[PDB]
Nucleic acid binder design. Structure first.
Length: 173
RNA sequence: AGUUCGGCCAUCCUACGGCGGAAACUCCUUAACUCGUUCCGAAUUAAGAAGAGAAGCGCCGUCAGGCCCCGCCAGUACUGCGAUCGGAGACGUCGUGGGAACACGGGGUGCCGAACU
């Protein structure tokens, strides 16, 4: 469950730099405290400005719409147990904040990489004609059909309350 | 502009070329006296005033060596505190604080104080 934030920051004005340059970044985080932490994390590494020498001008939460389905491409770098690697991933979602949740869960389940081990380089929306991965592509077509992937779950779920039954229920398909 | 006496002790040092002296400082001339050199008036002591910018000295120059300031190196190397974070270990990572060095690039190259001329 992520949100998306726009954060503004600047180094405190000095005598030889009365009006320092301002920097803007886009952050996905579960709350604004984490958002500011990550902002300072990147500003220290890229611009040599620490939290102690700078100030945050504004952390504004932005809510998307979320009606149709879009294809998102995510470029990231993560550190494993043997160094660092780049990675491109494709996700299908209604919002960019919801796509980040899917990406993070997939990275946790498949690569064993946690939130603070990952750096999101860029997030963009991709057209149906320039999809790179086969799953998203096969779901972008028209008139796509398939049977229910796990109909046993409905029958299993109802047996938890009705412990003893007079016949074995069938699985409709 | 110069000399005597100083403060801080290279932005003031070292090498090599060049410019200058009216006054000043200096180099210079002599060995009766004074004092002097393991031997030597070289040094030093005493007594002078024919010469001189050739040195010392003051100033200028050098894609100069050195010395000094700023940047970059680099939020890198290293590190204080917290973590049932990863790993068989060796070691690494995250959060929260501090933060270099060499190298390289650009520029610079004595002021201050008291007395006399």
């Amino acid at each position: 469950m992520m949100q998306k934030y726009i954060v503004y920051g600047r180094r405190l004005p000095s005598e030889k730099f009365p009006e320092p340059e301002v920097f803007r970044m886009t952050i996905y985080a579960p709350n604004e405290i984490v958002a500011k932490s990550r902002f300072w994390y990147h500003l220290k590494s890229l611009k040599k400005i620490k939290r102690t020498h700078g100030e945050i001008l504004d952390c504004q939460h932005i809510e998307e719409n979320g009606d149709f389905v879009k294809n998102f491409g995510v470029l990231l770098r993560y550190r494993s147990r043997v160094g660092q690697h780049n990675m491109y991933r494709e996700v299908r979602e209604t919002t960019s904040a919801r796509a980040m949740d899917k990406v993070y869960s997939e990275m946790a389940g498949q690569c064993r990489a946690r939130y603070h081990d990952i750096q999101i380089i860029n997030v963009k929306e991709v057209a149906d004609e320039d999809v790179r991965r086969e799953k998203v592509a096969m779901f972008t077509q028209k008139g796509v059909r398939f049977p229910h992937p796990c109909p046993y779950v409905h029958v299993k779920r109802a047996a938890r309350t009705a412990r003893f039954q007079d016949r074995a229920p069938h699985v409709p398909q």
